[PDB]
Amino acid sequence: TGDRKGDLYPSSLQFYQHPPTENISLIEFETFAIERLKLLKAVENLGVSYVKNSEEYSKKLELELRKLKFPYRPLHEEISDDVYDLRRKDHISHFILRLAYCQSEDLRRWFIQQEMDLFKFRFGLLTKESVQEFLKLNDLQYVAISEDEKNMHKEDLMNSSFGLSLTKMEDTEFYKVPFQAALDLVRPRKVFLWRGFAFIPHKDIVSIVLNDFRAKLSKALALSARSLPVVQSDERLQPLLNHLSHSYI
Amino acid sequence: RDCERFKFFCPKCGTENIYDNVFDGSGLQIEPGLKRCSKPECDASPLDYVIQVHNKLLLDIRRYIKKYYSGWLVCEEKTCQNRTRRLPLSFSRNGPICQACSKATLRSEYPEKALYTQLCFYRFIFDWDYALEKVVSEQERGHLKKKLFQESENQYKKLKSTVDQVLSRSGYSEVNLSKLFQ
Amino acid sequence: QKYGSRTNRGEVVTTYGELQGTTWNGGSGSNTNVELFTSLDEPLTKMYKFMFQKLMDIREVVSIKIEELGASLKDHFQIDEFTSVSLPAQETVTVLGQIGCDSNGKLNSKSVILEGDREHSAGMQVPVDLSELKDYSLFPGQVVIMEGTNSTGRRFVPTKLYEGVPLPFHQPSKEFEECPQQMVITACGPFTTSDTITYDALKDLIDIVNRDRPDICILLGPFLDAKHEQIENLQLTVTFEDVFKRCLKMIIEGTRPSGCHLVIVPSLRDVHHDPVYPQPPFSCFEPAKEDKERVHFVADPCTLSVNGVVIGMTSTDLLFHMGAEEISSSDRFSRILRHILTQRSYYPLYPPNEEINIDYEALYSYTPMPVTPDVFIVPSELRYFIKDVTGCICINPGRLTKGLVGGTYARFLVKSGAMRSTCISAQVVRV
Amino acid sequence: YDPASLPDVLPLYYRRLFPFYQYFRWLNYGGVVKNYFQHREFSFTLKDDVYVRYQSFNNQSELEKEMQKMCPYKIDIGAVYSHRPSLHNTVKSGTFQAQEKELVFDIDMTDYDDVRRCCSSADICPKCWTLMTIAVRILDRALAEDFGFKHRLWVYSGRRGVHCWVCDDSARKLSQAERSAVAEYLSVVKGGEETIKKVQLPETIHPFIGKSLKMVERYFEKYALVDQDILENKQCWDKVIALVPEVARESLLREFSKARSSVERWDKLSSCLEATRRYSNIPKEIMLQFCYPRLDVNVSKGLNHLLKSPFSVHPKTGRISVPIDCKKLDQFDPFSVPTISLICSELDNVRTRDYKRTSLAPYIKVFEQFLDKLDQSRKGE
Ligand SMILES: [Zn+2]
Ligand SMILES: [Zn+2]
Ligand SMILES: [Zn+2]
């Protein structure tokens, strides 16, 4: 927090809910737009080439994020100025690309897909503590079963979660979710269902988070497409936004 | 491609130097344009007279701004080509209606995009970092990314600061994100 | 050489008002209150983004100018209805519009066209025939109301040209009733001789300021002229900003003994400043802590309040610009000054002269004259003068330097509520 | 039963036996949601296999009328749409959407053909019906314990199997994806006729699979070892041998040459597998492959699926699609189910109580109890 910083960027991951309000330069605008376009194209290429759970995918995506200087890893130090800068980048670039990727349904779908992929990766890199922090800052309020109920269903929980040891299981706390949100977990039978609720440990959760994210993002893109006439009049940003999808990187 | 290039007359020999890129030459013979005069017999380095280069840059920027604000309009009809400074209040859906023929639109002789591109070009011909990344090759980049050019780099940064300052005051160097995202 | 050996130093070349002694003395800005005239519209005090004008915006600004002035004049004259300029009129009709030239040259009596506003005429033009008008004075961009007939539907024939209506003067508050008379020394650039960059005339003027201790010193640009022979041919060994900074330091530091409020007005000929009109104030110089309250970097044009006295000032050569285009049936400068006052704008000429860059949104926002000023400083390449136009004292102090020879400045005394004689005395004096 | 006699009996039944009052109570769901019954899709199959859909009705009177008028051979219930199906032509394209429907399962004996020996195709017998008896318990328990669905109506399909209607308000608002998830969660026996090993359990037995195996075990000895005799001769036990690793197959064959009873052969197989540990679940995989229900995910996935209405008449057997009481499941007999001919003989042998004089009464009673439970849930909530 050097000169003009604040608590505007608490966590690395964000749902991109609040538009930026700053006054940036045209050079900064262009640099951020192109950089995030490179990041999203890299995400798409790696998704096509590799399996998203593969270690090659993770290594290459980390390399790209480091090369373009985007937030991808947490830091249990504090909000360092450099970190703040990176987060600001991410936040502005995203919305710029929204302006670029809301004109046509095709484009919209593409954008959504890439964004979801990136978000998933970043979630996959979050430590449990950080994960909870995130789940709190956005009022997702995911916790929580009692200890007594846990002992009540101890054996069921043990046989539900893959690769969970007795003592290690005793060291873990689950959450109760309606089964309509754990579709991806229930469908392959990797989480216990009791009386319409799934008991999810502290792998499937990302799915629910992503669902929420996707909903929000789709809505946002619709609104952006509804607010397009105000931007077309700005010649400075027309060559970029109207043709970003066809920009050599 | 339609922008005027930077013309600077050497104080010593008086020969015109046309600048259209940060760097001139190929391979290890590549050096910043303002390092040596275009006349082989002339040993004067324009980088020595950087105050004069700054003054000429400001004068050129003033010239282009004056050209833009002159507000010259030409009829788009080939058979009319009426040239006027006066903008009439009578407009069609496409713009001002030419008062000579009453059937064609008046177009700006020097539109805002022209001035913006001219200022961007003047920034381009002084963008050391951009030239190194995009324009310059690999071996040339290596030869230019050493010492013996740091002073030239600093002077080029100072000269680019002028065009950046001018562009910051153009509505066609600041983007108000509040107006975009609401 | 020629300037330094001049023999007419201190000669009073023009005088007006109450006779004063051979020596003028001021209060050193002791009981002086200088501010920008507090009107409804906010003043231009900072840079505005420019170089981006949409033709639609220019159309709207010009149209609303015509509409607003016509509305005020219609209320004043009790005119019933305005008629579209373009439509034919067999009987006499009243039409509101703005004057213009049918070609790119200079206006003449046979090349006058009237362009109506969007509200009453859809922006249509009509040629004007001035054969039936006995007396007239027209310049391009002049908003006029005329009674006339258009029998052929192709040529408007005015029969009456309504006179202009100047804004009312300012009614000063009693807060400054007990303040003494204030002395103002006004000078306009160029400040250096054509063949020098040493600012000798400026040094002489600063000596005069310290000698007479005026209450306000109004310095109008250019301070680093773009047309200076040294500037154009690139013979300067230092940057433009450095020369301007040196000049401003000279002015501010040299006036420390006088304690005089300095009002600096930029000029379109300032090679170091943004070339756009209305010109924002200078912002490249930070006065020391001991001169912050004395220096006022104002915009071109400026309406200043000095103990209740409203002074209008512009660096632009309005008289030269409009004299080249004004056509009259039969004092020319008085006519042009009255035109400026009645149009209620510091630059009513449209299209402008070739030497001024006009941003029309800023022109709309910052060129309306709030009231009719008590004093109107209008430096010009034309001859110096002190005229009384409709109760406003219009002062042209000339330029401090006229080529190789020294020029002139002006000194006047202003007191709110005097006698309407807000200008006690005024004099154009030689440097 | 004479199917040429079907066109003679159908009207009388639809006039004096079909329980319209309770039917409307069901599909109207206590009137809570407006247009709920009015937006329900029906489909009719008339004589000479003439199919009509997008049938909707204003209330019970209109339904009784148009049904008694058409005398359909088949009645299928479909989704509740955004508008009335009758006016689907009037609804702007894309604005006609199926919004709610019961969650339904169809279990059909024909899907068990590769694993039953007593009958084939559409033939059923008392020796194979126990499979249905298992399914209803295995599935319904899950639906009552894992998912918490509280209002579940099991109905005989008339010939080859059983349907289940899960009618909880939550179950009626489930999207297509949620339905597919529910179906896949309940589904274990995966594969077609080209696959031999259709169950491959992991090392960890998911609690649901443990409880399904527990339910299976209670019946397995009677169904598979006594009745089906899945180890009667070589032609059959060769299959079960084909379902286990080759390593012990030879060891088993000699043993199966010295066994006189299939119960003995099962004991021997269990002992041999236990002696041989990652294969400790192989007997469970065999039991599941012979006992676990098979579910057509296409039946339950789609919202727009038209399923046989309760109290329909089977075009071939003539039996009435009667509800099955869960408690008395072990006593259910698909061969004693009233046929339309029997209930018309009963009707012509003696207004709102005529059905109480036929053998149809206890099944309408079970349906009335189920509807009473639904009403209690609608009120209490
Ligand atoms: Zn040279
Ligand atoms: Zn034309
Ligand atoms: Zn059988």
PDB file of N, CA, C and O in Angstrom, chain C residues 21-41:
ATOM      1  N   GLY C  21      -1.844  63.806 -11.936  1.00  0.00           N
ATOM      2  CA  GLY C  21      -0.507  64.354 -11.917  1.00  0.00           C
ATOM      3  C   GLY C  21       0.423  63.608 -12.852  1.00  0.00           C
ATOM      4  O   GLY C  21       0.114  62.537 -13.375  1.00  0.00           O
ATOM      5  N   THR C  22       1.600  64.197 -13.064  1.00  0.00           N
ATOM      6  CA  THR C  22       2.580  63.580 -13.949  1.00  0.00           C
ATOM      7  C   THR C  22       3.070  62.244 -13.409  1.00  0.00           C
ATOM      8  O   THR C  22       3.620  61.445 -14.174  1.00  0.00           O
ATOM      9  N   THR C  23       2.887  61.983 -12.118  1.00  0.00           N
ATOM     10  CA  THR C  23       3.305  60.734 -11.501  1.00  0.00           C
ATOM     11  C   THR C  23       2.088  60.024 -10.929  1.00  0.00           C
ATOM     12  O   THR C  23       1.227  60.651 -10.303  1.00  0.00           O
ATOM     13  N   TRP C  24       2.022  58.713 -11.148  1.00  0.00           N
ATOM     14  CA  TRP C  24       0.945  57.874 -10.647  1.00  0.00           C
ATOM     15  C   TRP C  24       1.475  56.979  -9.537  1.00  0.00           C
ATOM     16  O   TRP C  24       2.563  56.407  -9.658  1.00  0.00           O
ATOM     17  N   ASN C  25       0.705  56.857  -8.463  1.00  0.00           N
ATOM     18  CA  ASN C  25       1.065  56.012  -7.338  1.00  0.00           C
ATOM     19  C   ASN C  25      -0.125  55.148  -6.960  1.00  0.00           C
ATOM     20  O   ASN C  25      -1.280  55.565  -7.082  1.00  0.00           O
ATOM     21  N   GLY C  26       0.171  53.934  -6.499  1.00  0.00           N
ATOM     22  CA  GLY C  26      -0.837  52.983  -6.096  1.00  0.00           C
ATOM     23  C   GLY C  26      -0.629  52.509  -4.668  1.00  0.00           C
ATOM     24  O   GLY C  26       0.327  52.883  -3.989  1.00  0.00           O
ATOM     25  N   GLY C  27      -1.557  51.669  -4.229  1.00  0.00           N
ATOM     26  CA  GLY C  27      -1.557  51.148  -2.883  1.00  0.00           C
ATOM     27  C   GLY C  27      -0.718  49.909  -2.686  1.00  0.00           C
ATOM     28  O   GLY C  27      -0.755  49.317  -1.604  1.00  0.00           O
ATOM     29  N   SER C  28       0.038  49.491  -3.700  1.00  0.00           N
ATOM     30  CA  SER C  28       0.874  48.298  -3.612  1.00  0.00           C
ATOM     31  C   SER C  28       0.048  47.051  -3.320  1.00  0.00           C
ATOM     32  O   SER C  28       0.526  46.112  -2.683  1.00  0.00           O
ATOM     33  N   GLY C  29      -1.200  47.036  -3.774  1.00  0.00           N
ATOM     34  CA  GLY C  29      -2.059  45.891  -3.533  1.00  0.00           C
ATOM     35  C   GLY C  29      -2.317  45.622  -2.068  1.00  0.00           C
ATOM     36  O   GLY C  29      -2.390  44.459  -1.656  1.00  0.00           O
ATOM     37  N   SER C  30      -2.457  46.677  -1.265  1.00  0.00           N
ATOM     38  CA  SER C  30      -2.689  46.504   0.169  1.00  0.00           C
ATOM     39  C   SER C  30      -4.160  46.202   0.440  1.00  0.00           C
ATOM     40  O   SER C  30      -4.509  45.111   0.898  1.00  0.00           O
ATOM     41  N   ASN C  31      -5.031  47.165   0.164  1.00  0.00           N
ATOM     42  CA  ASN C  31      -6.477  46.968   0.277  1.00  0.00           C
ATOM     43  C   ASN C  31      -7.069  46.614  -1.085  1.00  0.00           C
ATOM     44  O   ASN C  31      -7.870  47.350  -1.662  1.00  0.00           O
ATOM     45  N   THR C  32      -6.658  45.458  -1.602  1.00  0.00           N
ATOM     46  CA  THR C  32      -7.061  44.990  -2.920  1.00  0.00           C
ATOM     47  C   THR C  32      -7.582  43.565  -2.826  1.00  0.00           C
ATOM     48  O   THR C  32      -6.988  42.720  -2.149  1.00  0.00           O
ATOM     49  N   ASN C  33      -8.692  43.303  -3.510  1.00  0.00           N
ATOM     50  CA  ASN C  33      -9.297  41.977  -3.561  1.00  0.00           C
ATOM     51  C   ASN C  33      -9.542  41.611  -5.017  1.00  0.00           C
ATOM     52  O   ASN C  33     -10.450  42.156  -5.654  1.00  0.00           O
ATOM     53  N   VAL C  34      -8.737  40.693  -5.543  1.00  0.00           N
ATOM     54  CA  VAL C  34      -8.803  40.275  -6.938  1.00  0.00           C
ATOM     55  C   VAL C  34      -9.308  38.843  -6.981  1.00  0.00           C
ATOM     56  O   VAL C  34      -8.757  37.964  -6.309  1.00  0.00           O
ATOM     57  N   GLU C  35     -10.347  38.606  -7.775  1.00  0.00           N
ATOM     58  CA  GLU C  35     -10.884  37.266  -7.945  1.00  0.00           C
ATOM     59  C   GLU C  35     -11.454  37.152  -9.353  1.00  0.00           C
ATOM     60  O   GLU C  35     -11.437  38.107 -10.125  1.00  0.00           O
ATOM     61  N   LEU C  36     -11.933  35.961  -9.694  1.00  0.00           N
ATOM     62  CA  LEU C  36     -12.651  35.756 -10.942  1.00  0.00           C
ATOM     63  C   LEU C  36     -14.126  36.056 -10.740  1.00  0.00           C
ATOM     64  O   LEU C  36     -14.712  35.691  -9.719  1.00  0.00           O
ATOM     65  N   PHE C  37     -14.726  36.730 -11.718  1.00  0.00           N
ATOM     66  CA  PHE C  37     -16.114  37.145 -11.588  1.00  0.00           C
ATOM     67  C   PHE C  37     -17.005  35.945 -11.324  1.00  0.00           C
ATOM     68  O   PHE C  37     -17.089  35.029 -12.147  1.00  0.00           O
ATOM     69  N   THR C  38     -17.680  35.960 -10.178  1.00  0.00           N
ATOM     70  CA  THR C  38     -18.534  34.854  -9.756  1.00  0.00           C
ATOM     71  C   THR C  38     -19.869  34.982 -10.473  1.00  0.00           C
ATOM     72  O   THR C  38     -20.750  35.732 -10.048  1.00  0.00           O
ATOM     73  N   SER C  39     -20.021  34.248 -11.566  1.00  0.00           N
ATOM     74  CA  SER C  39     -21.252  34.202 -12.333  1.00  0.00           C
ATOM     75  C   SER C  39     -21.850  32.806 -12.218  1.00  0.00           C
ATOM     76  O   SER C  39     -21.343  31.946 -11.493  1.00  0.00           O
ATOM     77  N   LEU C  40     -22.943  32.580 -12.943  1.00  0.00           N
ATOM     78  CA  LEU C  40     -23.571  31.264 -12.914  1.00  0.00           C
ATOM     79  C   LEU C  40     -22.636  30.195 -13.467  1.00  0.00           C
ATOM     80  O   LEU C  40     -22.528  29.101 -12.901  1.00  0.00           O
ATOM     81  N   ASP C  41     -21.945  30.496 -14.561  1.00  0.00           N
ATOM     82  CA  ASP C  41     -21.076  29.521 -15.207  1.00  0.00           C
ATOM     83  C   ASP C  41     -19.730  29.426 -14.501  1.00  0.00           C
ATOM     84  O   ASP C  41     -19.150  30.435 -14.093  1.00  0.00           O
TER      85      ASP C  41
END
